[PDB]
Design a protein around this ligand. Sequence first.
Ligand code: HEM
Ligand code: HEM
Ligand SMILES: N=C(Nc1ccc(CCNCc2cccc(NC(=N)c3ccco3)c2)cc1)c1ccco1
Ligand SMILES: N=C(Nc1ccc(CCNCc2cccc(NC(=N)c3ccco3)c2)cc1)c1ccco1
Ligand SMILES: C[C@H](O)[C@H](O)[C@H]1CNc2nc(N)[nH]c(=O)c2N1
Ligand SMILES: C[C@H](O)[C@H](O)[C@H]1CNc2nc(N)[nH]c(=O)c2N1
Ligand SMILES: [Cl-]
Ligand SMILES: [Cl-]
Ligand SMILES: [Gd]
Ligand SMILES: [Gd]
Ligand SMILES: [Gd]
Ligand SMILES: [Zn+2]
Lengths: 402, 403
Amino acid sequence: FPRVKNWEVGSITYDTLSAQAQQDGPCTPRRCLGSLVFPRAPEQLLSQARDFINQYYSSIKRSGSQAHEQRLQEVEAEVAATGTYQLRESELVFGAKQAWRNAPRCVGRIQWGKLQVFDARDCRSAQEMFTYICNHIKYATNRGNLRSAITVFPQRCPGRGDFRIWNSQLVRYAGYRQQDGSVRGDPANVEITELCIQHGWTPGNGRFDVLPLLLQAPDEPPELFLLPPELVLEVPLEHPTLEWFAALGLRWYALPAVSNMLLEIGGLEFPAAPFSGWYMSTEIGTRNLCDPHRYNILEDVAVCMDLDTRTTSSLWKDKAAVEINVAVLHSYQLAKVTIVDHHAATASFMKHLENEQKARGGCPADWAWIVPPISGSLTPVFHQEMVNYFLSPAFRYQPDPW
Amino acid sequence: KFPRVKNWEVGSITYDTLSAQAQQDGPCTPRRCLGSLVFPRAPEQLLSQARDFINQYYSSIKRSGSQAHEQRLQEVEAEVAATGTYQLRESELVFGAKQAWRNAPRCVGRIQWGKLQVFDARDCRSAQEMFTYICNHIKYATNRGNLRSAITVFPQRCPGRGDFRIWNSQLVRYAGYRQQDGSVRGDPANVEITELCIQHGWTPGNGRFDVLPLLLQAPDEPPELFLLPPELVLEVPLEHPTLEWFAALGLRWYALPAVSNMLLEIGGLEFPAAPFSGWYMSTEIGTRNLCDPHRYNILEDVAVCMDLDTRTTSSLWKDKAAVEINVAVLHSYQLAKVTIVDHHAATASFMKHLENEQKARGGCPADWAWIVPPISGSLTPVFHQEMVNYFLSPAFRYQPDPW
Ligand code: HEM
Ligand code: HEM
Ligand SMILES: N=C(Nc1ccc(CCNCc2cccc(NC(=N)c3ccco3)c2)cc1)c1ccco1
Ligand SMILES: N=C(Nc1ccc(CCNCc2cccc(NC(=N)c3ccco3)c2)cc1)c1ccco1
Ligand SMILES: C[C@H](O)[C@H](O)[C@H]1CNc2nc(N)[nH]c(=O)c2N1
Ligand SMILES: C[C@H](O)[C@H](O)[C@H]1CNc2nc(N)[nH]c(=O)c2N1
Ligand SMILES: [Cl-]
Ligand SMILES: [Cl-]
Ligand SMILES: [Gd]
Ligand SMILES: [Gd]
Ligand SMILES: [Gd]
Ligand SMILES: [Zn+2]
């Protein structure tokens, strides 16, 4: 049982939940790979299914009860008859919440109990997929009062291709390869922008052209779908005191809706299960706008602030980054779109760590992803030791469909 | 068999083949990663470590397999058989100290690892002579503000005789006076060593930046108190280039970061007293030492003076005040002509070190959480660089406090 220390306050906990870690991570006693982004039978399915049902009934205090045994026997027969089994709707809800709760890289898990689950397990085609997704975006956006939600499309099974959302998020800006090597738009989306074009999408030419969706029903080519503009809430970015900031033409979208991860529950796998919450401001103002391989606007902003950019020791990069994050917070609040700054969010995650210590003896957390990308040690999570391990149900990465 | 290592800014990929040579085990298992923890924690075992080190030495000078290489291996093996231990040649001590720095995974300044002045104090015999060696180190390294990296190696651990130890964690530390309330005047990180100084006879001050005396331990003796001559201790008064009230805070820091509580291990020999010094990266002072809530904790008072709105987190008053404190630190050291490096330049040079080491040794042990600076993390290139942490020897190691 690892000892976990907070170096700001001096408090000590012991992580007893890590003993129950399901799969194996990438580290060995010889070397730690904690900083890597991607860590490298019917009896197989039954064992995972049993552990999840036992989890679920323990969590509702029907532990070992009559309804517990009846569900266990039902799963056994279903797998024998068909090779898989079907979650009850309450189990699907519980499993989606647990998979969020178990995500080590998520700083927002104080919210894990409040999740809207849309059951799309009866979906039949890409057109129907598009309707579920539009319903999700509408519900989750809620005119800017964002609400967390997940839509669960049909599980994979043998003999049949998966449902897939080819886009990494529901809302993505195009990235256009230019004749001089550079990228106009978001460099992260250069591949999917080309995939949309190849599948017959008329490309824009702006830095913030919202991409169409490439949705894939089983064993069929993907279909392009245009998102109605009135459905995609965007926030033009302005600064509260730097009047020229508005004229940079920057904007970002309200709804972070991740669509390329796989949801795993009781040994079942959902390759299309988009989930959304709301943004932490550093995601937009630091990573998306200031990363050298994303919009990379830092030097542009520093020139407008008339900063000395020829020496690093004036900290022109730091001052411009902070004002971009100010602009993001100011612009979302003014537009009445839900957002949380990195101080508020890390303070809430500390409470989540405390709540989870009492709830189940620990909490899997990836320090490198929990600590914000600016002002790290100004937030309390910087001084918090953390233990990283993989519990199930879980969100996992998966290969691209193509 | 070798971990793939990716840089996400550039897209480039290497494989860390050096990790396969890791000589001691860390805290992680396939079940759970403990990389974020601060403390991750005999004749022919000595001999395998010694042989490996001699091999490293003869590799560095491109005489592997030479007669001199074989003869020195045989010489070490015969001394261990006779005495249970052995002595480093002078040249091996210099190489081993540099290698321990090169191997230190939490050090972002290792581009400098080949430039290290090594003072051989292995004939030191008393705490008084210890003090002379340390003062000479401080004078050399400080060099009136033009800082030079140096290490002084005191006698190795040996059976039947106690260790040399420097009780202070650094050669220059500000006192931390525990108040009756439980508050602290001065540096809270130094409350314990301050109380040990007073117990051993030091008359304490009552300032926020009182330089501590040294508690020096010779073998099998209680520690002995030595006052540093004030003119040996170069300090920098803190001011801001455009906020003139900042100078009225009365803040200062010292020029020379000289870590004195780590153990130097070379070829299985252990050196419990071997203080080493370089120069500061500005975030160490401006962000951690001055803005940590459990250190000097000045962030709110500076923000109030800047007339920022401290009642709401979303104004980012903490971020703005912290950046200006870092500006003050850099401006003040440059003004006083004391070597300092900012976190942008330091991490850029570390990236060049990673490329150097990938060609020289096929990898580089590095602790991401420690290499990424405490402000503006993703604005620096190391944020986007995957890293493999592992333990090589020669090494600098944590060791228990002598009391
Ligand atoms: C409610 C407000 C939420 C906030 C403020 C928040 C914040 C964050 C942030 C900042 C990250 C790091 C992402 C990155 O750096 O690219 C993250 C990751 C993650 N979030 Fe949350 N999140 C929220 C809700 C949710 C919800 C509702 C779910 C799922 C039901 C979820 C699941 C995840 C997962 C699986 C990751 C890891 C993603 C990856 O490794 O690529 N989050 N979150
Ligand atoms: C020359 C300029 C140098 C710079 C700018 C530099 C920078 C740094 C920084 C910023 C840290 C993290 C310190 C902390 O957060 O407490 C560190 C740690 C470390 N440095 Fe360097 N360093 C330099 C020279 C040296 C030298 C000369 C040595 C030894 C010969 C050394 C060995 C180490 C070790 C062993 C650590 C780990 C300390 C620990 O785990 O507590 N460094 N360095
Ligand atoms: N760049 C690549 N990989 C890669 C890219 C990004 C990641 C992590 C980013 N997930 C995006 C993401 C994930 C989770 C949360 C948010 N934000 C929220 N607030 C949110 C969404 C939903 C609820 O809350 C954003 C991991 C790997 C790449 C290129 C080629 C192959 O891979
Ligand atoms: N906090 C505790 N322990 C603890 C305290 C501090 C640390 C890390 C601090 N290293 C100080 C340090 C280490 C290395 C480099 C520098 N700087 C340089 N530039 C430099 C120096 C020499 C060459 O370059 C500073 C690790 C553990 C604690 C409280 C109670 C018991 O333990
Ligand atoms: C190499 C390193 O793991 C990578 O850049 C990580 C660091 N921490 C992160 N933290 C968050 N929240 N999101 C990220 O994409 C990353 N990227
Ligand atoms: C808990 C966490 O590991 C701790 O605060 C670490 C993080 N990274 C660090 N990085 C550096 N350079 N110095 C430190 O003291 C720490 N502290
Ligand atoms: Cl995003
Ligand atoms: Cl320090
Ligand atoms: Gd102007
Ligand atoms: Gd330039
Ligand atoms: Gd002024
Ligand atoms: Zn690890």
